[PDB]
């Protein structure tokens, strides 16, 4: 009863039937990165199985290879998209600070527009990951600075209605 050959055969058959492939445009249109978490797990599903001695198929090995190469790039891209989405939600929820953060918004949108034409096979995909991180990094810092300053201005203007009626 303890033989696990059936489990390995079933898993290999399921993954082959899925026919997972990362090739395609790096983004698609909510913004998404065409790199699901599952493509990571298959690589690990090979990494342990090779230790267990099961002869994994060559195509599965190649898919694990592509997953391993593109996973850090996909994490950088999905982190950038998630940061942009949450920060955009924060900015939309507070319409007062929309004008100040206009430059970072148009910059990141322009970088995304440049990247729509890219593919996972593009050599320029890795330099774009470098480009997007810097611009998003600047956008986060300046937004953080304004929130500190804007609250102080909000408190100070709030002080005026209740402050003492003297010129000083």
């Amino acid at each position: 009863k303890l033989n696990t050959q059936e489990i390995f055969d079933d898993w290999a058959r399921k993954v082959q039937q899925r026919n997972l492939g990362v090739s395609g445009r790096i983004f698609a249109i909510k913004l998404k990165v065409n790199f699901l978490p599952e493509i990571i797990t298959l690589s690990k599903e090979v990494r342990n199985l090779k230790w267990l001695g099961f002869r994994v198929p060559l195509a599965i090995v190649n898919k694990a290879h592509q997953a391993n190469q593109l996973y850090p790039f996909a994490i950088s891209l999905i982190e950038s998209v998630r940061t942009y989405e949450r920060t955009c939600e924060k900015v939309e929820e507070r319409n007062t600070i929309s004008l100040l953060v206009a430059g970072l918004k148009k910059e990141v949108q322009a970088l995304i527009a440049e990247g729509i034409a890219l593919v996972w096979e593009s050599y320029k995909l890795d330099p774009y990951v470098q480009r997007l991180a810097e611009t998003v990094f600047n956008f986060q810092e300046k937004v953080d600075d304004l929130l500190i300053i804007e609250e102080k201005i909000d408190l100070e203007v709030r002080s005026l209605e209740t402050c003492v009626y003297d010129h000083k």
Binding site: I29, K30, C88, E89, I116
Partner: peptide
Amino acid sequence: ELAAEDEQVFLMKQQSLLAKQ
């Protein structure tokens, strides 16, 4: 007044882009 595109309007634009492709 430059304003960030709403999620819905930006995604309708992206829908228009994807559909035509």
